[PDB]
């Protein structure tokens, strides 16, 4: 609504406006300050009374002159949704930053949208196999699920997601949303190029993927509502189109982090580690706007930049709570050179059950877990005294486990450049078989190096021959 105001304060990117008329926009309304930098979009976040709101600014605030005229756009920012989104990279505002000009708008929807109700929930049970051995063996995914990754971001974390895109999303087909909060601009450009190359984006034709990209150069405040914008695009697919989607979020640490930055400026008493007090609510709301309703099933992949790789940090901790499966990837396992670097004793899925994937799968997994846990248990003893000073029975276990550890590496085709090894995807049925044999020590008689950086059991057998020469 045309409500003039003046800019009382510009304390960071948290401008405060003072409306001069007694008509006052409500909280989560949006305002445009028009400048020679065009509109700057701000969003009301507090009412501080005396006709003075305090607004988060979703665009950079450098150059603002106090008292500058504001005009209130009214209500939450309305992005444009449709299938016309597919084949666009859109800014937080909704601007087509892939410069395919104005997006043909159908319905433009408010960024803030209440999460669907308890009644609307529909529980999954699907098996989604990625053909990644470690994923398949340890913690199978499911369609509609919330998948989770933890560790250093784009230190292999980004690559993991890229492998997932490469596998899952061609098979899945249909709508898919990639939303990248605070990602490295060059990496995003690579993704854009790659997507166009793999035709998922075909700009000449139609694209069955849409993209939202928020660069890490984008101001902290902008980054906060990149996520909400992406979720709206997803909701249009989930609800209105009613076709199964995909969603990628990288990193949802950036969502939390962005909030913590603005929180201080906003005027909140800092909570532990310095995180915003509204950390629990904001994360909660976000993670319940990503869900599988009876209307539609949205498989989501969420990437958590764990700061200093401390899981005990409250922001990663509260993330762990809202995920349906996680596959924490550890720097230590990275040092061991195992790519994928998923920690095998720190993965879980509610889909790993002896009903869900059957007793035989579960039994296979049980033995892997036990073997590896023993190996972890004897790590102290191994270091202090030689392995020869361990019990003979234990030495068999240790040798088996060393083999299992090496076996778990699966070359990835997206990482084909980096590894220099052509990637291989191994069937879920094949994976269970391969591990079963190894657990029975069938192929335990050939070097650890044979198991190192190679795919399935058959490949190992062949690789023994290669080494033997």
């Amino acid at each position: 609504t045309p409500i003039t105001g003046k800019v009382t304060a510009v304390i960071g990117a948290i401008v405060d406006v003072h409306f001069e008329q007694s008509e006052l926009p409500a909280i989560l309304n949006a305002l445009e300050i028009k400048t020679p930098q065009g509109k700057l979009v701000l969003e009301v976040a507090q009412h501080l009374g005396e006709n003075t709101v305090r607004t988060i600014a979703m665009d950079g605030t450098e150059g603002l002159v106090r008292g500058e005229k504001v005009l209130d756009t009214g209500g939450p920012i309305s992005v444009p949704v449709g299938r016309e989104t597919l084949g666009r990279i859109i800014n937080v505002i909704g601007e087509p930053i892939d410069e395919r000009g104005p997006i043909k708008s159908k319905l433009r929807k408010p960024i803030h949208a209440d999460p669907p109700s308890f009644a609307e929930q529909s529980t999954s049970a699907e098996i989604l196999e990625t053909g990644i051995k470690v994923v398949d063996l340890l913690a199978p995914y499911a369609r509609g699920g919330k998948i989770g990754l933890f560790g250093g971001a784009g230190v292999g974390k980004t690559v993991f997601i890229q492998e997932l895109i490469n596998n899952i999303a061609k098979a899945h087909g249909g709508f898919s949303v990639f939303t990248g909060v605070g990602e490295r601009t060059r990496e995003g450009n690579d993704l854009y190029r790659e997507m166009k190359e793999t035709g998922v984006i075909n700009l000449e034709g139609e694209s069955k993927v849409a993209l939202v990209f928020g660069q890490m150069n984008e101001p902290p405040g902008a980054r906060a509502r990149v996520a909400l914008t992406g979720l709206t695009i997803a909701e249009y697919f989930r609800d209105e189109e009613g076709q199964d989607v995909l969603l990628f979020i990288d990193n949802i640490f950036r969502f939390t982090q962005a909030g913590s930055e603005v929180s201080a400026l906003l005027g909140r008493i800092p909570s532990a580690v310095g995180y915003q007090p509204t950390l629990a609510t904001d994360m909660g709301l976000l993670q319940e706007r990503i869900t599988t309703t009876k209307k539609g099933s949205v498989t989501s992949v969420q990437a958590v930049y764990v700061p200093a790789d401390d899981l005990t940090d409250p922001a990663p901790a509260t993330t762990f709570a809202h995920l349906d499966a996680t596959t924490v990837l550890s720097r230590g396992i990275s040092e061991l050179g195992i790519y994928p670097a998923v920690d095998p004793l720190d993965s879980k899925s509610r889909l790993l059950d002896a009903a869900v994937v059957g007793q035989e799968h579960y039994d296979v997994a049980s033995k892997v877990q036990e073997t590896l846990q023993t190996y972890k248990s004897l790590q102290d003893i191994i270091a202090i005294l030689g392995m020869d000073e361990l019990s003979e029975q234990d030495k068999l276990t240790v040798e088996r486990a060393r083999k299992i550890q090496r076996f778990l590496s699966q070359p990835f085709a997206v990482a084909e450049v980096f590894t220099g090894i052509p990637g291989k995807l191994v069937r879920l049925k094949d994976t269970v078989a391969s591990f079963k044999a190894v657990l029975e020590g069938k192929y335990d008689n050939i070097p650890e190096h044979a198991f190192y950086m190679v795919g399935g059991i058959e490949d190992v057998v062949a690789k023994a021959e290669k080494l033997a020469a």
Binding site: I27, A119, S271, Q373, I381
Partner: protein, 501 residues
């Protein structure tokens, strides 16, 4: 249709309000409103903001009374009038809550029509006094043999399930609920525990899976599910355990026995933290406000075995606290540990080791002890504690791998078999009448001989064998609940007979 009747009801709400207290919103933001006015205002009062948002009031200041919204502030706006409900927060309490999922304000969120409520009650209700309490003497069997044996559950007891994040954390509790099917299905009202599962801070999908699991085992026909999903307001989350407690009290008051699982209180603390810090209350220790102990304690002390003059009522509680990184010295875990009467420490390493359910028996205590342990089960598991304790000591020495003497290896061999005996399949509790034999066998060392690998096979077979032959014996274990000389001899003979299979 249905619409015409609904519109008729809507037309049927008229009649002017006299709004004896008003106040104008001014500082509002962060979902925490502060209104100026409200000269009359009870503390903890529920105030209806004119926008269809209701918010309880937790800070009364000589300027601006701080009313914490139960809604989102995107429907609130500056300078609104607020009308005091004139009732401190209250919930419908009744029998109809059985088989219903309800949100904090008692709206069925499973939408199985309006709650059949026999009363309303208030969120804060003072705990049962010293005088109206009688000592616990009523077992509660969780159907997890390790739990029953090591840390027996009774009625009116508070025992804290503590351990690392969602290590089937919910599932450990869920098993208890599931085993209460055996008595619950039964018509013995003196063994009827109506079960209230309280879920705070969990996403709607998690809750939905749980209620589905409960429906799968058809246990929802005795369950009440109080939920406060993570979407729902931090004030509503804070209020959520206390309104669950009152719902429990209706059962307790009726004298009917019940059990309330408070999963997870750790998220209540986060909620209270948010609430307090945006009520601008001075930051407490570890940022959790310093009166969290009082908050949690008052909640926990309302489960008790009421006196026989109070009709032997008993709400039983099981709090559940997630330990972040297993930090047992953290302020919130420390506070809860003190309040409770037991610890049921779950250890991640032992989970990975494949001891599921995973219990670090040294960090698990039941300070309310075997006064609530089944008399038969006390006899059989008498030296089980000693054996396990010896096993722990022996295991430590064994790590060094020095050539162990035969006495140490008697323990070691016995201990290994015991550990395998404890293990049980998740989502499949076992009948106590048929857990007493298994412990007899183990304690009377028959299994010590039997090879570790085939212990699992033996267990299955032993039960089948007892079902085949000594089903007269099993009936007696249920019926007489104390192993007499005759039962001990019968059982001894049966086990001996089954040694070679």
């Amino acid at each position: 249709e249905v619409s015409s009747i609904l519109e008729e009801r809507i037309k049927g709400v008229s009649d002017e309000a006299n709004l004896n207290e008003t106040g104008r919103v001014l500082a509002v933001g962060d979902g925490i409103a502060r209104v100026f006015g409200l000269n009359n205002i009870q503390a903890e009062e529920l105030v209806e903001f004119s926008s269809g948002v209701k918010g309880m009031a937790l800070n009364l200041e000589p300027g601006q009374v701080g009313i914490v919204l139960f809604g989102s502030d995107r429907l609130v706006k500056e300078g609104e009038l607020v009308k005091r409900t004139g009732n401190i927060v209250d919930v419908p309490v009744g029998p109809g809550l059985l088989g219903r999922v309800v949100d904090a304000l008692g709206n069925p969120i499973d939408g199985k029509g309006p709650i059949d409520a026999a009363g309303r009650s208030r969120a804060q209700v003072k705990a049962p006094g010293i005088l109206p309490r009688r000592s616990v003497h009523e077992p509660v069997q969780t159907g997890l043999k390790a739990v029953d044996a090591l840390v027996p559950i009774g009625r009116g007891q508070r025992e804290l399930i503590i351990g690392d994040r969602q290590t089937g954390k919910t599932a450990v509790a869920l098993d208890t609920i599931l085993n209460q099917k055996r008595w619950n299905n039964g018509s013995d009202e003196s063994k009827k525990l109506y079960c209230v599962y309280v879920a705070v801070g969990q996403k709607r999908s998690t809750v939905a899976q749980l209620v589905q699991t409960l429906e799968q085992h058809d246990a929802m026909k005795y369950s009440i599910i109080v939920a406060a999903t993570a979407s729902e307001a931090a004030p509503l989350q804070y209020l959520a355990p206390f309104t669950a407690a009152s719902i429990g009290e209706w059962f307790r008051d009726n004298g009917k026995h019940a059990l309330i699982v408070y999963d997870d209180l750790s998220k209540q603390a986060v909620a209270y933290r948010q609430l307090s810090l945006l009520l601008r209350r001075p930051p407490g220790r570890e940022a959790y406000p310093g009166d969290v102990f009082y908050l949690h304690s008052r909640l926990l002390e309302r489960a008790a075995k009421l006196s026989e003059k109070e009709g032997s009522g008993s709400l039983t509680a099981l709090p559940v606290i997630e330990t972040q990184g297993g930090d047992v010295s953290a302020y919130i875990p420390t506070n809860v540990i003190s309040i409770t009467d037991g610890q049921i420490f779950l250890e991640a390493e032992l989970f990975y080791k494949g001891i599921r359910p995973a219990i670090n028996v040294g960090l698990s205590v039941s300070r309310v002890g075997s006064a609530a342990q089944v008399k038969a089960l006390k006899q059989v598991a008498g030296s089980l504690k000693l054996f396990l304790a010896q096993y722990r000591e022996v295991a430590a020495f064994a790590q060094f791998g020095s050539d162990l003497d035969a006495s140490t290896k008697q323990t070691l061999v016995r201990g290994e078999r015991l550990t395998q005996l404890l293990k049980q399949n998740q989502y499949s509790p076992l009948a106590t009448e048929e857990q007493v034999p298994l412990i007899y066998a183990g304690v009377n060392g028959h299994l010590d001989g039997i090879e570790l690998s085939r212990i699992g096979e033996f267990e299955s077979s032993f039960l089948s064998y007892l079902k085949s032959n000594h089903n007269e014996l099993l009936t007696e274990i249920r019926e007489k609940g104390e192993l007499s000389k005759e039962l001990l001899a019968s059982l001894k003979s049966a086990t001996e007979s089954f040694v070679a299979t």
